[model samples]
Target: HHWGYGKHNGPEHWHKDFPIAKGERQSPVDIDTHTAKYDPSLKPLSVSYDQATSLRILNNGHAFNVEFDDSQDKAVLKGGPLDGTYRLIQFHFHWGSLDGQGSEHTVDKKKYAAELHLVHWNTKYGDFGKAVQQPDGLAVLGIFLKVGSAKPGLQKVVDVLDSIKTKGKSADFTNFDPRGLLPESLDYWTYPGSLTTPPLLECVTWIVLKEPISVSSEQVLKFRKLNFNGEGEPEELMVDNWRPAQPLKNRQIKASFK
Candidate 1:
């Protein structure tokens, strides 16, 4: 059976096929700020995204994502609790059907309107597939999004949704820089976690930012416009495509700032 965010095929049912879903280092954990300790040893995060490296965008029936050309280190993430350089592969969002609740990782038990995951693979692994399974193979930076004024950088992707509104649909989406979406402060809460989605591999080094970026409500709801089903099939909005936060067993949520 296919894994989805629906009641019957969602996170709860994933472990039947992907047993690691119940593993110790699962992702999207609630960030209890009070409990997170400040770690001065963590370096500040650094990222450089060459807009020329952006390749395409698609409605993959899970989340609307933008893919990057990772042939070289044009779009790479370094430092900030990471041991090696990680190449940006793609960025996607997890949002609810409405504005009140949508983010995957929460802060102080409060949710944001949505969350963006900038997925990357460590260069040392040599291949994306090979990198994903190693303990330090992958790094995903989570950026929380709240509703307010419309963001200029986010609109470019929102406007192109209609072009690829169904599963398996894609369109060229180059010259878009994701760095604009980052908030001013790099302060974050991080820990070892897994891919929150299916095949829930325990290989991710999760760095979730403390500051949240703002986007207009309309821009966020536009995400619900994409169809989970393919063209001409029974249309279902792709919302709540996020796995709930997992247990924090044997893990410590460290803060990059005090």
Candidate 2:
């Protein structure tokens, strides 16, 4: 059977297909604030996005992703703990069926309603495919989503979900800056980790923001309406797509702020 967030093919069973699931740098780890080290030298994150670079929204079966045109340096991420500029390839979200908890990474064992990942690859590697294997290849910015006031920036994305409700469906989504979805405080915790999905490569430098952005309960429920099944097959609700937190062995979590 294909990999999914179900009992037969979920994260617990991913290692059968992707051996790297047990790799040392696995992601979605629990961030213990009391143990995190504050690095005074860590540079503030630099995020530059060109609204025109946003291409379209896709229901990639696993999750809903907003793909970007990473052909140029128009949308780039630099500074922070990164060595060079990384181009924004796409962004996706992970959430639960309901709203109490769904975030992959937890702080002090507490989970949020959802999490947003801005996937980027190092410019030095040229492309995301090649970068997925190297040690310093990819960088993912993790932003937590909590239930509160409605987020207009996120509504723009939610509005397009109806058109791309089924797997393989896509719709033109442009002129929206992903940066509008970020929180005011950029303070984050850095660590070396892997993708939280199958073919789990240990090539990501994860920068997870400490502050969560707010979204209304209604807005959060819309994500659960998307389907994992394609046109003719049996339908399946797409929810709880997040992988469980892995062991934080030997790796140190660094913070950008005290």
Candidate 3:
């Protein structure tokens, strides 16, 4: 792979081809709570999902994404720093080799076991493909997965990993409520940010939930069972598939609560 988490094709080298890698407002910033100002005006966010909208979970080499049937507005994310309703397109996970430091975004310099990204696109822009390039086009709900008791919410996806074990592989996954994956508290920190990976578009309005959902250490390790390579390619496990924290440069992190 040209952009695996290897020394050669890592995030540091991404700037060579995609200069925006160093652009302002890149994601996975050190979510310093001390600096996050309380914003009373930022309304509480809401996520509504139609259980049948979930489609298949695929391994795109970097991370495994559970795709949703985004043909229409079956699932939508609204309020909290958003100007309009955004349709849920898909959700993916980023993790670490070890349980201590896998999540993309850190809190007060502390990293979690993993991070979940629920991606949505603004309806006014038509669809995801078109919305990704526009500044206010996408709204990503970020959930931190801490290592704790097994979560009923994540097991469903873990149960289907064998079918989609390698890059470019996928399986039929449906009838799951994505809402089950969220934490009890919707309180979050919002900021203007970009994609954590390559071609890093600065289009996402990141809503990182303050409370982390729990996932067992074993469950968190299951993600590494995936392969970064295809069937015929050299063998490689998809571990440590998260980008390091980027410079927060000229950005404000707003908290929904004090």
Best-fitting candidate, scored by lDDT: 2
Ranking by lDDT: 2, 1, 3
TM-score of every candidate = 0.98, 0.98, 0.98
Cα error, candidate 3, residue 71 (Å): 1.5
Cα lDDT tens digits for candidate 2, 1-258: 789999999999999999999989999999999999999999999988754388899999999999999998888899999999999999999999877788999998999999999999999987888898799999999999999999999999999999988899999998878978999999999999999998899999999999999999899999999999997889899999999999999899999989
Clashing pairs in 3: none
lDDT of 1 at 224: 83
Clashes of each: 0, 0, 0
Ranked by lDDT, the better of candidates 2 and 3 is: 2
Ten residues in a row with the worst lDDT in model 3? Answer: 46-55
Q: Is 1 or 3 the stronger prediction by lDDT?
A: 1
In model 2, what are the clashing residue pairs, if there are any? none
lDDT on C-alpha atoms for all candidate structures: 0.91, 0.93, 0.90
Backbone clashes (count) for model 1: 0
Residues 168-227, model 1: lDDT tens digits = 999999899898788888888889999989888899999999999999999998998888
